[PDB]
Amino acid sequence: HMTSFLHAYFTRLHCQPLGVPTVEALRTLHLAHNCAIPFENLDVLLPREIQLDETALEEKLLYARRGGYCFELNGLFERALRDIGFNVRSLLGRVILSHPASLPPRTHRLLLVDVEDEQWIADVGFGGQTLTAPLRLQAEIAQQTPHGEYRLMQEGSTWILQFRHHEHWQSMYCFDLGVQQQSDHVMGNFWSAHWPQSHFRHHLLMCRHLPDGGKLTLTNFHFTRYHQGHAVEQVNVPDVPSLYQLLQQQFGLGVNDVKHGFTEAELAAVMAAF
Template sequence: MTPFLDAYFARIDFAGKPDVSIDTLRSLHALHNAAIPFENLDVVLPREIELTDEAIFNKLVVARRGGYCFEQNGLFERVLREIGFNVRSLLGRVVLSNPAQMPPRTHRVLLVTLDDQQWLADVGFGGQTLTAPVRLAANIEQETPHGLYRLQPAGTDWILQFRHHEKWQSMYQLEIGPQYQADFVMGNFHSAHWPQSHFRHHLLMCRHFTDGSKLTLTNFHFTWWKAGQVIKEIVAPDARSLHGLLQEHFGQGADHPQYGFSADALEVTMSRFNLHEEGR
């Protein structure tokens, strides 16, 4: 075991003995989703998001913050590789909003090869993120703790879909070919700096718990979900209350000298957003 893995396992509360198996992959995937929130706080503060191993580790593990796909799946790839998994990152084009034109490659996801079987692992897609790996196989409905998913071939690419209101909704289209660090740097920069990026216009967070429930945040609006149904909602009355609720409900580390965030900084940032906007 390495110091990096020890720190990561403590962060997600993993107490087992990791091996290169589907059981370990499933366990780590679920615990990661529950412990490390998806969030874009650094984009709206605004701060630069660095993708070095050291920066991702210090932010998500040491400082107990969350992050979005480039950070989340970057950390998870490193974890799996140090355990001994055959894993590499892919890039996808997010089509959740049914865009009129094919969007750029702005979603990082992992391909794991295990006993000659390929699995898709993704701990960084916000409210609809996978909470278990799914086999890279065509048109097979696959159950996860938080919903039903399937993969469809699209030429040499694959499209991940989830079941929503009795219909299949496409999430992203994946390219299976080789990807390079420069590709992730470019996708990260576009996500954080493109004026029309939704990450620049809303504070977004999500945690998927191991009991099948999840907690989402859009700006000031917290929503608890289970089995696709809303079970509770809270609207933070102001940014200073929000600062405390982010620590309480998302476990956000606020005190780290580099990656923490003050109530004053959050208040300035949130003054740009609508207090009453509903989140899902």
């Protein structure tokens, strides 16, 4: 089967339809998504509200060929997996990367999927280190992904996500299986986009994934290409115009669109802040 949405979804993913919800279907759609729809926080910097209703998501991520973060990316992904027949629901977790003194709020969204009597967690909106393949809900088991190796702890009811780095597990963010509501994401988005100290308001962030363990990475003017998890080439874009181009070339950003597009002069005012 294929719903109106599901249609342009596959179309944007440069991928072939799938009607049977299986671990393999997940396996691929995940990577598909990770390579087609970039991680971007541009609507936060050029001030511009982020809707999270399936429709705004559809028009932003699919039709306008734009990116987003936690809430937008996994929001779209969740819909797709749902329309394909999977069993999904979102979860909120706490970003602990910076290794904070005290647990932070539920800033991050992610998906919980029930495929073939097991429980997996798919997440395409974490940015730089997002997963690129479902993982099984189990501790210790060093799970493998096209772009890295991860391990999930089991501290109580709550879980922690980790990934290898210099031969030692590193925790990315914690989370439990509690139900969440749209509003809970709206609040999450509200925090992330508007709390003054949120890092998303202090620098442009883009990140897209490539087929063979490669990925792209923008952080203001610092562009970086990676292969099999290695820093191959690091260009420091010299100007706004040049960057405007880089956004469309490398990340495939839909710079035009009645609604979600944005002039190059706008990108300039944004980078001007820094």
